[PDB]
Every structure is written in C-alpha cells, then in structure tokens.
Amino acid sequence: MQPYWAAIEADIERYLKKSITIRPPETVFGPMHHLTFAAPATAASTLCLAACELVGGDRSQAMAAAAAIHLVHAAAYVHEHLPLTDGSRPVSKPAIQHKYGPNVELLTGDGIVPFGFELLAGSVDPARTDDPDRILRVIIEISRAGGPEGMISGLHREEEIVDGNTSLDFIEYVCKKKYGEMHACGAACGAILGGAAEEEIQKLRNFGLYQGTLRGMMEMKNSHQLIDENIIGKLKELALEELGGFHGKNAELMSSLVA
Amino acid sequence: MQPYWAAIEADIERYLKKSITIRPPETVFGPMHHLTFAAPATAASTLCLAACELVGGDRSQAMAAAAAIHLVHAAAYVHEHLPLTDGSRPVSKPAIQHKYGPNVELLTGDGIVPFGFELLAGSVDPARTDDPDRILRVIIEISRAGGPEGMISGLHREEEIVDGNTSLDFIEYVCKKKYGEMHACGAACGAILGGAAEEEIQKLRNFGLYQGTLRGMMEMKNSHQLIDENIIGKLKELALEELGGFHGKNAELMSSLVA
Amino acid sequence: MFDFDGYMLRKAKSVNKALEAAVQMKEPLKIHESMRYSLLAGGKRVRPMLCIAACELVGGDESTAMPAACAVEMIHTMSLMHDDLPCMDNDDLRRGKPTNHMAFGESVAVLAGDALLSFAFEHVAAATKGAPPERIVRVLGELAVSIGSEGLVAGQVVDVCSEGMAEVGLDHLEFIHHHKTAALLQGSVVLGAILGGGKEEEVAKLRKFANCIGLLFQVVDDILDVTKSSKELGKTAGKDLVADKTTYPKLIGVEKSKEFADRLNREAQEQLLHFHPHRAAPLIALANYIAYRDN
Amino acid sequence: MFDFDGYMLRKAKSVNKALEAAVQMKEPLKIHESMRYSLLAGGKRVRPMLCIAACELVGGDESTAMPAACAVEMIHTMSLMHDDLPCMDNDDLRRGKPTNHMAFGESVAVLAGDALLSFAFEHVAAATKGAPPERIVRVLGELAVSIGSEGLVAGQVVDVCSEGMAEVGLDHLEFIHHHKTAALLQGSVVLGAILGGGKEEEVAKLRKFANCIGLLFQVVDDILDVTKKTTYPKLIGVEKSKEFADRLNREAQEQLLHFHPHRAAPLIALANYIAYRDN
C-alpha cells in the first residue's frame, strides 16, 4: 500500500522518459517532453499496471497502455488549462503556469495523444501471438475513454459547475465522466493485457469506474464544500463489492485507494 | 394524405373512440376523450399496423399497440403546450387553443399514458400463444420511447432552440428524439407483434427512425425556413434503404410513406 | 414478538438503495437530476413496503417484487411533483426541501414527472425476474388501472373540480379519497400478491385489505394536515383548510375523523385474519404505522 | 483516364455518406454539433480518396478502407479547427463560413477537435472489417506516426515557430511542407495499401508517390500565387520551381509504373491534376 504504488509510478515514468527523447527539432520535442511530465500523474495508468499483475501478467505487458493512458490524460490536462480569449471556458482559479505559449501547448497536446497509440502499436511483439488482438482491443478502450463520450464529455460538462450552486448528483456525474471512464479503462486494459477472462475484466472495469469517480470526487472536495460522507461511501461499497471474486492483497490492495 | 394511410388512421380513431367512452365522472372522462383526439395524428401509430401487415400478421394484432402509441404521444403533446406561469418553457409562438385549464390538462395527460398500457395488458387474448411475451416487449418499447431518453429528451432540448441562430443539425436531433424514436418504436412494435425476426424488426425500426425524423423536419419546416432539400433527401434516402429487402403490395405502401 | 421499527428500517433501506440504482444520472442531465431530486429526497416508502410485504405474505421473495415496488414509488413520486405545481396545489415544500418546480422550473418538473411515470412501466416490465411473462403483463395492467381514469388520476381531477364544492357529500368525498389515494395503495398490495404467486382468493382478500388502509391513509393525511406543522410534515401544511377542499376534518371534525381511522384500521386488520398471524405481522404493522405515523 | 472529376466526386460522395453516419449528433450535443460542423462541411476529400484508391490499387476493396478513409479526413478536419484558433492563425472564416470556435466558442472547438482525433483511432480500430488484427494495429501505428511529432503536428509547431525569422532556407521550408502536408497524405495511402493486402515493396512505392505529390502541391501553390516570408519562387525562382514541380510529378508517376494501369490511372490522374491545376 506504500512502496508498491510508488514503484509503479516510477516505472511508468522511467518508460516515458525513455520513449520521449528531446532531440531535433527541439522546438517540437522540448514542449512534448515538458508537458508530458508537467502533467500530474493519473491513477488510471497505475491501475492499468496493477490490474495486469493482479491477473497474472508481467508489468511490461501493460506498460505501453499505461503510458498511452498517461499521455491521453496529459494532453487533456494541457488542453483544459488553455488561456482562452473568449472566456468560454470557466475561469479556473487554480491557474497552472505556462512555460510555452497557448498555440504551442494546443499543438503539443495534439502530438502527445497519437504518441500513445504509436507506443501501443509499436509495442506489438511479433513473437507473441496474442499481442495483436489484445493491443487492438486496448486501442479501442483508450480511444473511447479519451473520446467524445468519455473524458471529453466530463471536461465539457465540468464547465457548467457553479462553485457553490450545483448538486452532488451532477458533480458525481462529471467525475464519473472525467475520471471514472478513464480509470475503468485502465483497469480493464491491464486485465485484458494480462490475459484475464471476460468476467475478471468486467469486474476490474467496474471497480475502476467507481474508483475513479471517487478519486475525482475528492479532487473537487477541497473546492465544493458539500461532499456528503454518503457519496464516497456509496461508491466505495459499489467498488469494493465488485471485487467479490478476487481475494488476497493485490486482490484487496486495489482497495488501498478507497481508504 | 394517401388513402391507405388515411384509412388506417380512421381505424385507429374508431378503435380509440370505442375504447374511451364518456361516462361518469364526466369531469374525468370528458377531457380524457377530448384531449386524446385534440392531439395531432401521429404516423408512429399507423406505422405500427402497417409494419405488422408488411411482415405477415394481421393489423388487429397491433391495434392496441397503435392506440397506446397515439395516447403516449397525445399526453406528451398536451403537456408540451401546457400554460406555465414561471415562464420555464420559452413561450413558443404556437399558442394553441385550450378547452380546459392547465390543471385538468396536466392530470389528463397523466391519465392517458397509463390507459395506453391498460389497453395493451388487456388486449391479451387467450386464443393467442406468444401473446404475453410480445406484448411485454412492446410495453418496453413504448414506455422507453415515451421515457426520459426518448420523447422527453427531444421535448427538453427543443426548449433550447432559438429560431434565430440554431443549426439544422441540432433541429434534426430534436426531431429524431421527439418524433423519430416514437416512429421507430411503432414500426418495431408492429414488426414484433406481426411475428417478424430480429433482422426485420431492426430494419423496420430504422426505417421508422428516419421517417419520423423526416416528418419532424417537415413540421418544423414551416417554422425554421432553412430546411435544404439535402437534409430531406438524406433522410429519405436513409429510410428507403432500410426497406430495400421487402417486396410485395405493402412494400410499396410502406415505401410511399417517405416517397 | 415482532419488531416493526426494525423491519421497516431495513425494508426502506433496501428500497432506497434500489431506487438509487434504478434511476442514475445520465443525459439529459437536468431531467435525470430532477427525477432523482424528488425520488430520492425521502418519503416513508409505504407503497413499496406494502408491495414487498404482500409478495412475502403469499410465498414470494423481495427480489421478485423490488422492481414493481420501485415502480409504484416512482409513480407516487411524480404524482406529488405534479400535485405541487402552480396550476395544481402550488406548494413550496415537499419531503423537507423546496418543491421540484422551484428547483428546476415548471418545465423540467413536468417532464421529469412524466419520465418517472413511463419509466415505472419500463422498469417493472424489463427488470422483473422470477415471474412468468403473462404474470408481469397482468401486473402492468393492475398498475395502469390503479393510476389512471378509474384510479389516481380520476380522484385527483375530481379533487380539483370539487375544490369549491360547498355541497359536499360523504359519497363524493369517499370517491376522491378512494381514487386519489386508496387506488395506488391497492395497486401496490395487489402487484406484490400477484407477483408473489398468490391465488385469486388471497389477492381478493388483500385488495379489500388494501382498500381499507388505502382509505385510512387519506383520512390520516387529512388529519395530519391540520394538526402538524410544515416543518414536521416535510411539506406545506394547512392549505387544505383555507381551501374549500373536501376532507374528513371538514365534514365531521378532527375527533370524529380519528375514531373513523380507528375503525378502518380495525376493519383492515380483520381482512388479515385470512392469513396465518405470524405471516401477517408485517402487514399488520404497516397498517398501524399508516394509522399512527406522525408524518 | 476518362472523367477524373467524376471519379473524385463519386469517392467524395461515398466518403461524405460514411462520415455522416460515423459522427451522428448525440449528447453532449454541442461537442458533436461542433465535430460535424467542420467534418461535414464538404471539400474534395482528397485524403479519403488516396486511402481508398491505394487500397483498391493493390486488390483490396473500398469497404475495407472506408473507416480508415474517414479517419484521415477526421484528423485533417481537426487539424484545421485547431489551426484556425485565435492563439493560432486566428481565423474568423474558412470556405466563406464562420470558423468553428466562432460558431461554438473556443472551448468547444478545442474539445471537439480532440474528439475527432481520438475518434479517428476508435473508428479505424473498431469498424475496420476484412483485415486481420495485426494489420489493423499496424495501420493504427502508421496513422499516429503520420500525424504526430514526426508528422503533422511537427509541421504545425515548426511553422508557427518560424513566423519570427523570415530567414528560412529551402530545407526548412521543405520540412514544414513535408510535415504539414505530405505526412498525412502518406498516412492515407499507407493505410489503404496495407489494409488492401499490399506487399511491403508496393507499400514503399506508395509512400514515395504521396511524399512527391505532397510536396508537389505546395510548390505548385507557390507558383500559382506568383503567376496570378518564404516561398519556392523566392528561394529558387519560378523557373526552377516549375522544373521542380515537373520532377516531383514524374517521380510520383514513376512509383506507379508496375501496378495495374487501370487501377493506377486515378492516382496518375490526381498527380497530373495537382501539377497542372489553374487555381
């Protein structure tokens, strides 16, 4: 519950730095490296590696997916903090600093997302016969979760939140969309890449879904003072119950985030 | 209106008049009767009888469903023209005529919808084997089309239409939800009750979806003069395709609805 | 000994948990938020408990009746949402919070109400397991009849068309209360008994039983309306007096209403002698609760 | 070939129908309305045509290549929606109609553009039928490589990072054109060749064909603006710009020499069209 989770973030990082070498033209790769690592890590990638190991796979078998999920998150993160001239997007009080200009952040965001899919396609080991189908499936999972009906829906509806005038039901929904979809995605992918069966996958997917909603639910707790102890408790049960069929530490270590 | 369709509509009208007979308390059944026939006729309803014929069954097997469809549509029409004090709904120019006050209209609407389910549950003829499973399936199609993700979604979004600056795309989506889904539901139910197979049901569902959307655009055509013949041809084309695979007399009839 | 407080506590918990799972937030967000705002706000859940208890009494289990139970509470909820609107009773408090139209506007309150009504039918039809299709269909028809022009809606329209009727009669008042309130309660008891596998005779005896508590629930509502405060009742209380409305505290006064409720309860529990007393305990308890509740 | 215009128009029609069907209006409505606003506005659909033509050239069929043909148009579309942005080229118009962020706001324009990018991947991955999994994954790989930091985006960054020092040489200008234009054309033709079952040698000749016509386009475009900052005429003169355009066209066509003449005809016809067009 302490060193394990840490090492995962380190391995994912070590892998991204290995894959993203600042080189010529530094005008493209300087911002690409910066913005990828300036983005706060997301538990959806961690969850991806943990689910892979949980079902028995080797950590590397899901490293490409984990990095692709981080990259999708990093690109959305960059884009959601873009200084916009028309004031269409709500003024985010916690103003991230900008080392590069809007134009450069926007395009870099557009180059990071495809790098995720590049890593994934590029992680196919021709010597591993199950590689194609599993990675194909994962590309569908990640592209859906970061797409219009996943994360983007959450990012879009998030702009409707009035800091002290929006219900907890609406906030919970924005979190399931903004974070839950992606967490579910990562756990589902880790399970797929690990060789898990459909039943296992759906369970872990479900778990991730509640897990991420719960996590994002807190990313805002320190903002919308209304977080009734009931929501976080309802999501925990739904999550911890979905694990019914997976016992042990890692099979009960996933639940180290619902603490 | 074409003679075949007009004749089918007349049969639904008769079946409805026989099903709703003014009696005491007249204060209840008077508005029930009047508001049923005060609502526009809907093709989602005749499409149900027709769909049934096209696949083999006899229209009388789909009459209760057709009446239930009209009734659900009628309660929705009554409620969407309801006089609201607080100005919650953009005062649509319509300003239709009202024989009864807002309270009686509101309640009667709430009474009409279950009557549709009552006919359905009661058209259960002993001398019918597969009766129960299909009716039950039809209740699901109908309660869904008249539910939160069906007509109600279309009515809700319609309130966001500003005759001024709102795209044809957005209007088409409202017509799809407000009219298309109910029409799709009517052709599907007809098919279901006739005895078709999943493949036919989906084709007829899809045909209903497009025709209903096309019809909705016609009705809103006389409001937002912008409907390029492209939108209509598109929908028209989309519909006919679904019918490609049905040959006979009714085949050209069903085909005449859009053509 | 039968611990009624404990029983209702866990039945209501079970019901509240299924209502929350059945009606999730999804697009269009405001319609679904409005549906959940009034549905999950906090009623006593008498109707869904009566449905489950009647199912259990005749042999069935809760799981088979939960969808119908949720459905009657959905229909009951939208009927209060619609009852509260400006064109109706025009109230500002329901279940301890501002009324639905105050929070979302009249447009959304009407539509959210309509969504709950249709979805109740969807839900019992598609989520019921453990019952033959012909039995579900039958239940859907009992539900439809108990809430339409010969049930809930009729009592409600006769109520607003006889709100100035100075020439009130027991017959007229009985019509309103039986239709407006007893009809949905009968329906809840009936859906449970049929889904539980009950025989025609047991259904008929429960329908009669439900008729009694059904009428009793409204007499008690009429009495609370005049002896309890809005804060206590969780809704605007006291407007039935200022209105020429038809109630019992009107035609016979509070006290004569109390005695009347007692007889009704008595008469309801008498229909229960049809069943073994150990099994009837829950419905006997729900019956007293309906008679002696505070809100 | 006979009737090159008719051939392009038939391909754009098929593509338009498939785009319309793949990106339907749905919740959240503003996001989807914005996606369709720019995706379905009409244009030549050259990228989709390249994909389909390349697939059919090696024996495959249009059906197998359509998801991919649509995906490349999806990327092209969001590259322009993002490019028109205020922080970018700050355009208010495009093809005469208001730019996307003017119609829907900057926030939606950004998100809607992001949605087309991820949907391109989704659609190719999930809707492609008639091709084995490793082939679809390979194709997904070429699409990311053609639009990322070593493709489209690289050209977009460097271009915006060069509007400060007007002292740009031929190499620099070619980098931008190759990235901003040829990379995505190369992607289209590679997606189609692979999906169609083409050998690696066929695939390599198509990549060369596209890179030549990709550059051919920017060269001819510069010659046109002159016979009507850096440009081919300011770097090497119109005479040499025209010689270069001709060499690009000849090399492009040289790549198609060993394929079926009849299947190669449309690509040969498009090369001549880009080279000789009047506007």
Ligand SMILES: C=C(C)CCOP(=O)(O)OP(=O)(O)O
């Ligand atoms: C008495 C009638 C007709 C309606 C109010 O019913 P309730 O008293 O059951 O109120 P809730 O507990 O459901 O909120």
Ligand SMILES: C=C(C)CCOP(=O)(O)OP(=O)(O)O
């Ligand atoms: C013709 C080539 C090689 C490239 C440009 O395509 P377009 O961008 O001109 O397509 P349109 O969108 O203008 O129709």
Ligand SMILES: CC(C)=CCSP(=O)(O)OP(=O)(O)O
């Ligand atoms: C039966 C229905 C639909 C509404 C309530 S009847 P009523 O207005 O007499 O009772 P309420 O005080 O509003 O609960």
Ligand SMILES: [Mg+2]
């Ligand atoms: Mg009332």
Ligand SMILES: [Mg+2]
């Ligand atoms: Mg009231």
Ligand SMILES: [Mg+2]
């Ligand atoms: Mg530009």
Ligand SMILES: [Mg+2]
């Ligand atoms: Mg521009």
